[PDB]
Design a protein around this ligand. Structure first.
Ligand SMILES: CN1C(=O)CN=C(c2ccccc2)c2cc(Cl)ccc21
Ligand SMILES: CN1C(=O)CN=C(c2ccccc2)c2cc(Cl)ccc21
Ligand SMILES: CN1C(=O)CN=C(c2ccccc2)c2cc(Cl)ccc21
Ligand SMILES: CN1C(=O)CN=C(c2ccccc2)c2cc(Cl)ccc21
Ligand SMILES: CN1C(=O)CN=C(c2ccccc2)c2cc(Cl)ccc21
Ligand SMILES: *[C@@H]1O[C@H](CO)[C@@H](O)[C@H](O)[C@H]1NC(C)=O
Ligand SMILES: *[C@@H]1O[C@H](CO)[C@@H](O)[C@H](O)[C@H]1NC(C)=O
Ligand SMILES: *[C@@H]1O[C@H](CO)[C@@H](O)[C@H](O)[C@H]1NC(C)=O
Ligand SMILES: *[C@@H]1O[C@H](CO)[C@@H](O)[C@H](O)[C@H]1NC(C)=O
Ligand SMILES: *[C@@H]1O[C@H](CO)[C@@H](O)[C@H](O)[C@H]1NC(C)=O
Lengths: 336, 336, 336, 336, 336
């Protein structure tokens, strides 16, 4: 009962043209789309791109492939995929999208008596996600994913999500493979765009990203905090030890300078000030200000020692208090 | 006696459709799989991927290729591989899998009178291995390898290991080419998954990895240990040498700070504290604490020299003892 | 009413040769071109290349595809693109240009009764943009984009912009994805070139680029400015503290030296002096000159203390004034 | 006299099946192989791979292509290469081997009356060469190159070198393009391997590599030697200059620490001690030991100055002598 | 008058075999070659490769494509390129050569009544240029470019430049895109090579390269010069300031050491001494020698102060003079 299937396949192909869409000149082709994200890949800030692997599924109705037989379903493989007409779907923001070939071309194609068709297609999309690094690292990003049609305007092909929007897009629980982000949720929608040729249908999915802090705390914030504390120790050393206090001030200032260079090496070369830069700038003033206090004190330690000694003791208390007060404002404002 | 073989090949192809599986509508196709890992490639922690080269072998029974002749075996090459039906096997976790082309496409195909078939296929799979770096570097990882079918549910195609599981997967003795891991052993199993289309068969193989220590000992642990010892030398210097003791404390603190930055450059940017980070943090306190002791001593060396001198001598003994005691707890706990 | 279209397509292909241009031996083929830049990619100074993604559109008239039927337009896909003749357009400066393949080959083809044709083609061009880094970073660049024909001289194929030049090239408002440049505007034009074979038509588009400053201010300029200020603090320290003033001078000089090396690491290895190099050179003299003043003062502080003390006080005022005066000339000259 | 050749080619192809080896069921096919290495590419220690470009030549006898005519030789190109049967040769250790395509596919094929055939094939093999870095950099490596057959066991296809082994493999005098190795010589041999399918023939070629020293001398050895000499200068400074001697000891110790980190950055992350590591470890003790001597001397310079002064003078002589004595043992042992 | 051309093309292909060269068994095919270098790409010292883009043109006479008609020329495209016989030209030293595909395959093909043919082919060749870095950076290099035939010996195919050698190779004025080299000129020639198969014709073109200095002056030479000057300032400081002079000597020595490591990071790991290395070695002695002078002076400043003071003053003059004298010899010898 196998040769019976062979005759059915041969008959449908004969008299069938793959260069023409179903319902041409009679109606408008309607396509139902569903998605399942297997893994959300890493996000590269420098390249403003993210990698995503999905099992894209599409469905459309064709009246030219109707048949009757013992079975109502015809499981198949990539061999027959190119023999019939399929939509020229593309991703608008996809810089470079490539499919999978080995071990076998990941494709499927099924047909039913009523003309319903199914066409799954594994993909690996390296899309582009622009990001505004104004509140970095306390920033939230919305990386989109837009897919539609190239040569078929809305008057011919229209894409609509199957069933409700809740089940339209599915993300695996373990599919979040981000080392510096949290996948809060997803949103979907539809819209139209206008060009010279005509209107087109756009299906859009947005992923809400919440960055996870903790890597920069151990990398930039803590060294800056400890460096500031190191300089303040000089305030507890007697003035006559000019050389000893000089070493503390000079080393700390250079240490802060090199940290700023190192921090931005991996960060994108954005031409504006981020939140982290302001924190380093404030820490720079504290260490720099302490050095000035020593120089001013050392210059009047002879004529009027009383004022110099009074300032030194006062500095021990004022400086730590201001640093602690500033931190609460900085963290509370951003974490609220 | 060569043209006799030519007629046999031509006859089988005629009347044979490669788009339909054997036993369609009559039974369920059964596939027997065996593997031989030639080389386990390097594991990239940053990319969470590992490279593996295997000689994948598959076997299935087809009743449409039966023949009789002088020979019961028909050795062949890649030429006839695409002329018949082969399963659309794929790797679920394979990010990007590509076969080999030169010098000649590495493929084979053999047939027997009873319909038994053999299809070997060399492969180079760059799979993805998620890892939890909580006990790093004293961590054990289990990198999996899942392969199955794309368009053929369990009702049609089922994969089962040939013979026992012991001989199902073979790893060469010299095939372990890991510079920072040990290949302890392997495990295999089977499971099913459910999706919209239907149930599918999953064949899984797990590799147990035990990291080898010794690279980080010479890179991070030892410099931290020697840096701590350097600071303690200051306790054996007289107080009046304020400048000399200042150099020891400042240089050591900055040395520890830069080591932390350097260590995590190669390590993945995990947003949580590893075991190595805690060790560096403890070493940071020791050098930092020593600097505080000098500052406190230098501030009361005049009013009450007796207490300052007593503290200095006590510090020489307490500090080394605590560092030695802590090391035993750290190493014993992780190495046990 | 679908099979009617099938007959039309078959008839046109028969008797139609794709190896010959329309109007061969009768007239000169005329092509109308329009462009829409979806995104202007990043500019790599080291590689002197920039990436651009466009939706290139072309139009030409052919008398061999005329037909009459219910519809005056025949939307199609990549299937029929290769079946007919299309110009062998190429980019002269394109080092490596590749099209898009997945999810479907991004191409379109439409025909009309009068013979008018449309052929859109998505592209990603990695062109080369030579740049003269003489006023870097205060520099303006004009990256061109030249496209024409390879084997068809001007006597056969001529390219002309459609409608006016204003609408010939369109750039999306959000298509400017440059992190270190501003897209001021665009210009277009036409020209001819002469070679051994004959004359050819050239269509050129130029993009005016204005670099955005602010990344180098936080990276190179500010550390140099703060480093100079650090050295001048030594002028407020008494001469007897020889060791203390030595630390300031030595550390600052080495700090400037390493900044110069770090700055040019990312910058292209141009064999001539840039504007930034001169700024660093001036800052080098200030810190170096201060060290010389201390050495000269320390060498005559005994024989004639009066002159040494007078010079030290004068240095406190002259040095800051000159640095401030120089900055106004440097910034005003370049920013004007 | 050109059409005469055309008839000969057409006749041979008709009735000739490329899917069957010559002498099938009658004898065992014998293949003669010769090689000419155009250039031995660079060896990447990190990737344990080396690149080699060769002009591989193969020869086998087929009785199905016999002909008679004016010429006994038929020079041809890649066009006819795929029309006949060729062995499915492959490289066992080749991770990723690709041929050359432009300007024209580099292939050749010649036939003679007796059935002798020639098939040259340019190749670029990126093989894998495991190396044991125990005597690094005084190490000798033997990178192999194994090639055989995939689907044809020894009972069907056997590879044997043509003529003697001396002329079997040829390496160009200028083909050695190694910047850190010397190509001492080559060796060849044959062996069999056993698998599930059956026995296979293996043809192996080994290249003997002798590393050239001189890059590491200027990079690691000399800085370590000069750093040790710098510390010993402190022994010629009076004890009262506590600060001056402190700077020498601290700077040298940190300098050695950073050199160890820098040296292993390029070197593979081997989890065992190399010869170079031991040399750095010995140098670490010398500088570290000198610092301890100063601390111990400074702690008893008051109670018993005589012993402290005596030790200081003795250290000036003992330390340099031991360093010189150790170097002779280290270099002589490895260079002998 | 278009169908007339169609008949001509069809007739020529019929009865024409592309697997046989023209004049087979009657004469020797002669090929005329001309080149036009559009852009000389960057030269990578580490990889010993350079990229070049050319418009290669070839010409040969075939008597099997003669025709008569209204036009004596048949402009065409890549469609007919593969339908006829073309030489299997290849580049001997080309590691990896690839052609251009988009927007259209860059190829052309023209035919004339007498049988003359033209075949242009755009190319991007990543050739290999061995270089001897003995006088680096004052070195001159001659990167060659060899092209010939693979399967056609001299007895069948011979390559000869068209017209004179002056016009044989053309380089655009703006085609020199080298950031660290000057394109002085070009030379061409012919030669034969002998192998097992037979003699072959070689066409060679050499490009003379003169490196441009100025990048290394700002990177390595100047920091070394300024570092030496910094150390000499210590000679103008009184002996009693032991700590101050110690800082100058130690910092300068370490600064020179790190510069040597940094300089060779980008430079190829050549296992022999370059000219730049000797310059750094001389600078190393000057700073190192100054430190020794201070140590020796400080050790005898009590017993015989007169000799120590006399040496210190003499050092101020001798050391600067020797450094200036050495520079003239170094620069004059290499720049002459
Ligand atoms: C609005 N618009 C145009 O006018 C150019 N044509 C298109 C287009 C072309 C084919 C199909 C859909 C859309 C296009 C594509 C993008 Cl990704 C952004 C804007 C845009
Ligand atoms: C359970 N599931 C789905 O629902 C989506 N479809 C599939 C699938 C699709 C085709 C064959 C097998 C499985 C799939 C694939 C992975 Cl890798 C993980 C989950 C998953
Ligand atoms: C003027 N010229 C030549 O003489 C070589 N031929 C060409 C050419 C070849 C085919 C089509 C167009 C132009 C060419 C191409 C460039 Cl990109 C620059 C200069 C140049
Ligand atoms: C001994 N062996 C096997 O059992 C697996 N099959 C093979 C094989 C498969 C086809 C041809 C030759 C050999 C093989 C290949 C290597 Cl590279 C190493 C061991 C090994
Ligand atoms: C002299 N020689 C040989 O003997 C090996 N065969 C060849 C060859 C093979 C085919 C065509 C031309 C030349 C060859 C190629 C090079 Cl690139 C260098 C040396 C060499
Ligand atoms: C998009 O076009 C379709 C055409 O049927 C229309 O129904 C729909 O309302 C449009 N959507 C928007 C947002 O304009
Ligand atoms: C998987 O499906 C097969 C269907 O025959 C069944 O026999 C087997 O028990 C299932 N395995 C599991 C783990 O459910
Ligand atoms: C280019 O060639 C065309 C040929 O028709 C001519 O009309 C045009 O004036 C030429 N342009 C220039 C700038 O020479
Ligand atoms: C390999 O197999 C062949 C089979 O003919 C045999 O002659 C040869 O001795 C074998 N070599 C070894 C090393 O066993
Ligand atoms: C190369 O071979 C040709 C064969 O005709 C000969 O004429 C020519 O002189 C040879 N050139 C050299 C340099 O030997």
């Amino acid at each position: 009962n196998i040769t019976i299937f062979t005759r059915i396949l041969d008959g449908l192909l004969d008299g069938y043209d793959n260069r023409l869409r179903p319902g041409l000149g009679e109606r408008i082709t309607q396509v139902r789309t569903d998605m399942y994200v297997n893994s959300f890949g890493p996000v590269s800030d420098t390249e403003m791109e993210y990698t995503i692997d999905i099992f894209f599924a599409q469905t459309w109705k064709d009246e030219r492939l109707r048949f009757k037989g013992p079975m109502q379903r015809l499981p198949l493989n990539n061999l027959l995929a190119s023999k019939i007409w399929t939509p020229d779907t593309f991703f608008h923001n996809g810089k470079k999208s490539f499919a999978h070939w080995m071990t076998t071309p990941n494709r499927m194609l099924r047909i039913w008596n009523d003309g319903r068709v199914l066409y799954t297609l594994r993909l690996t999309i390296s899309a582009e996600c622009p990001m505004d690094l104004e509140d970095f690292p306390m920033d939230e990003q919305n990386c989109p994913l837009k897919f539609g049609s190239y040569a078929y305007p809305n008057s011919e092909v229209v894409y609509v999500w199957t069933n409700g929007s809740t089940k339209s897009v599915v993300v695996a629980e373990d599919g979040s493979r981000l080392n510096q982000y949290h996948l809060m949720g997803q949103t979907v929608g539809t819209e139209n765009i206008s060009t010279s040729t005509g209107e087109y249908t756009i299906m859009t999915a947005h992923f809400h990203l919440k960055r996870k802090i903790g890597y920069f705390v151990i990398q930039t914030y803590l060294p800056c905090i400890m460096t500031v504390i190191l300089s303040q120790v000089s305030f507890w050393l007697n003035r006559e030890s000019v050389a000893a206090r000089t070493v503390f001030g000079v080393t700390t200032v250079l240490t802060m300078t090199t940290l700023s260079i190192s921090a931005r090496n991996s960060l994108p070369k954005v031409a504006y000030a981020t939140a982290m830069d302001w924190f380093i700038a404030v820490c720079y003033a504290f260490v720099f200000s302490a050095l000035l206090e020593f120089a001013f004190v050392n210059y009047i330690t002879k004529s009027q020692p009383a004022r110099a000694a009074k300032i030194d003791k006062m500095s021990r208390i004022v400086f730590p208090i201001l640093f602690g007060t500033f931190n609460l404002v900085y963290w509370a404002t951003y974490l609220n």
